[PDB]
Amino acid sequence: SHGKQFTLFNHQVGPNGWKVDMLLRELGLSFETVYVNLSFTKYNPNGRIPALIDHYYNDFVVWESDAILLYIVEKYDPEHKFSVSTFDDKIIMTQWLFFQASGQGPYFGQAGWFLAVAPPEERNPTIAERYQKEILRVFGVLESVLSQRQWLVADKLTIADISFVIWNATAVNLLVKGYKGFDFEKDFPSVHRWHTALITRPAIAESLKTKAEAIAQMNR
Amino acid sequence: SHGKQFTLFNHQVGPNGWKVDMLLRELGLSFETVYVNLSFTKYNPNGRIPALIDHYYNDFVVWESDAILLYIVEKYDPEHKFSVSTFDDKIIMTQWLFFQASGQGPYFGQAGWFLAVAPPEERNPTIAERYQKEILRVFGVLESVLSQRQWLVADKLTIADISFVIWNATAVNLLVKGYKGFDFEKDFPSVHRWHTALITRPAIAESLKTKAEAIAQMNR
Numbered sequence: 001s002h003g004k005q006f007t008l009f010n011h012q013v014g015p016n017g018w019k020v021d022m023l024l025r026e027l028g029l030s031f032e033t034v035y036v037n038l039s040f041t042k043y044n045p046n047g048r049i050p051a052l053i054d055h056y057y058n059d060f061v062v063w064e065s066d067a068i069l070l071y072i073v074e075k076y077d078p079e080h081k082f083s084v085s086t087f088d089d090k091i092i093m094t095q096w097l098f099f100q101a102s103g104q105g106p107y108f109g110q111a112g113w114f115l116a117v118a119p120p121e122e123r124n125p126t127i128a129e130r131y132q133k134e135i136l137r138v139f140g141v142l143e144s145v146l147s148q149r150q151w152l153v154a155d156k157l158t159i160a161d162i163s164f165v166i167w168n169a170t171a172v173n174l175l176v177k178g179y180k181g182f183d184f185e186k187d188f189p190s191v192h193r194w195h196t197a198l199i200t201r202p203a204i205a206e207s208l209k210t211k212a213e214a215i216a217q218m219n220r
Numbered sequence: 221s222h223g224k225q226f227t228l229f230n231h232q233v234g235p236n237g238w239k240v241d242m243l244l245r246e247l248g249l250s251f252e253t254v255y256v257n258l259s260f261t262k263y264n265p266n267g268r269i270p271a272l273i274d275h276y277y278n279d280f281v282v283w284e285s286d287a288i289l290l291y292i293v294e295k296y297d298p299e300h301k302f303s304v305s306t307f308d309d310k311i312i313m314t315q316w317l318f319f320q321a322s323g324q325g326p327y328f329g330q331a332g333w334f335l336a337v338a339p340p341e342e343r344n345p346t347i348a349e350r351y352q353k354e355i356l357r358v359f360g361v362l363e364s365v366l367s368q369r370q371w372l373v374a375d376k377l378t379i380a381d382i383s384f385v386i387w388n389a390t391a392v393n394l395l396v397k398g399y400k401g402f403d404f405e406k407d408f409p410s411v412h413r414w415h416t417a418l419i420t421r422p423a424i425a426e427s428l429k430t431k432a433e434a435i436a437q438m439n440r
């Protein structure tokens with residue numbers, strides 16, 4: 001047929017590529033997904049997914065999931081459906097993306113490593129508890145903010161909010177499920193409100209459905 | 221006298237605020253440093269340093285060290301001495317900042333936690349080795365790139381390069397010093413070249429000197 005605009009190098013299990021999948025569906029953009037078995041370093045020297053190739057921009061490549069989000073909205077969100085136009089809003093949107101990238105992803109991922117996805121002999125629930133506690137602390141930070149604002153930035157849905165979704169879903173369903181009586185809605189009602197709003201959006205729900213189906217299809 | 225432009229909430233031991241200290245000195249900007257004992261959540265809901273108050277911009281506040289770097293150069297680097305002007309360069313500069321924020325800081329910090337700065341009973345050199353190995357992997361990523369480019373972006377010094385300095389110095393002097401025969405110049409000569417270029421810059425050297433002096437003055 002005709003070449004789609006984007007290649008998203010993604011992974012069925014790993015959360016981070018699905019931030020980008022969510023945004024591409026939200027904006028209605030055309031992309032193929034390549035699930036990478038975890039070249040590729042030719043597209044990202046760090047050797048990690050996601051990476052994005054923009055075939056309609058001379059095969060421009062961007063890696064780091066949150067940098068990909070910014071690229072997409074800076075080039076392909078002219079009506080600012082999921083982004084912002086003023087300088088002040090832009091820098092605060094970037095602030096919250098860096099909090100996601102440095103404060104959620106890595107620490108949620110260490111909980112996942114020691115609880116769930118390391119080789120079984122290397123899993124360690126005692127060490128994992130350090131990062132389960134960090135998950136709850138991050139939830140507490142989000143709670144203190146979202147108790148008094150609808151969205152993170154400019155009172156509108158942006159990629160700042162979207163960037164938190166996939167790891168938050170992983171945390172609630174897996175990483176802190178059953179941890180010391182954790183109850184998402186009771187313990188962090190504002191985060192629950194915000195998260196539930198996000199995952200019930202058609203495009204985001206479609207992304208989560210696609211991820212589940214993709215896991216079901218990957219053998220094993 | 222007269223109020224300085226910026227307040228940098230910093231810490232003597234913690235690396236991350238010193239990225240911002242480096243940039244402010246490089247640009248010759250006026251700032252006071254407040255060393256926070258580790259309000260403050262009034263300036264950052266995450267409750268972490270650094271945070272920046274811009275008194276000449278109606279006390280605008282930005283937190284997350286790499287978001288602070290972007291704020292400073294986007295508003296106060298009109299000649300692009302440590303930043304870039306084209307879209308393509310801007311997005312790749314942001315890409316490398318997100319790699320620093322998500323791939324260096326957090327994993328280097330976990331090595332520091334389990335090796336060096338956790339309460340002594342909670343330190344664990346076996347667990348630390350997971351993150352010492354991640355330090356070397358990050359060095360290997362930087363090596364593969366810096367063997368064929370002088371600086372990370374646009375063949376010029378930017379905040380992308382500066383953002384890596386403080387954690388790299390901590391890693392070489394502490395976190396992987398003596399780890400399995402680690403020798404910075406022999407094992408990662410390109411990273412060593414780049415890092416040495418950075419720390420010998422007067423403003424960056426001044427920042428590192430100030431940090432050492434600040435540790436020497438903080439009692440204990």
Ligand SMILES: N[C@@H](CCC(=O)N[C@@H](CSSC[C@H](NC(=O)CC[C@H](N)C(=O)O)C(=O)NCC(=O)O)C(=O)NCC(=O)O)C(=O)O
Pocket residue numbers: 011013014015016017038047048049050063064065066101104105106107108109110113318322323
């Ligand atoms: N900051 C990067 C992180 C990208 C990333 O982590 N990609 C994973 C797939 S998501 S899977 C989640 C991922 N876990 C892992 O990657 C587990 C393997 C790893 N080497 C380890 O030892 O921890 C993690 O914890 N991420 C922390 C974060 O989100 O910031 C990958 O490619 N792994 C290949 C490999 O490791 O060899 C981004 O957002 O793009």
Ligand SMILES: N[C@@H](CCC(=O)N[C@@H](CSSC[C@H](NC(=O)CC[C@H](N)C(=O)O)C(=O)NCC(=O)O)C(=O)NCC(=O)O)C(=O)O
Pocket residue numbers: 098102103231233234235236237258267268269270283284285286321324325326327328329330333
């Ligand atoms: N991404 C943020 C990280 C900022 C940050 O980590 N600030 C530290 C001082 S630098 S000191 C380095 C810091 N270690 C710590 O903060 C140790 C305490 C922590 N609660 C823990 O249990 O790990 C770390 O590992 N950082 C990972 C990274 O750079 O991304 C802080 O305020 N700590 C107060 C507290 O923890 O209560 C940024 O760059 O601004």
Ligand SMILES: O=[N+]([O-])c1cccc([N+](=O)[O-])c1
Pocket residue numbers: 013014015108109110111112113116117170174175
């Ligand atoms: O990558 N992880 O660290 C991780 C951990 C726990 C769960 C899942 N998950 O459900 O896809 C992923």
Ligand SMILES: O=[N+]([O-])c1cccc([N+](=O)[O-])c1
Pocket residue numbers: 233234235328329330331332333336337390394395
């Ligand atoms: O904060 N840390 O994780 C850390 C670790 C190891 C060393 C230093 N240091 O030297 O300032 C800091």
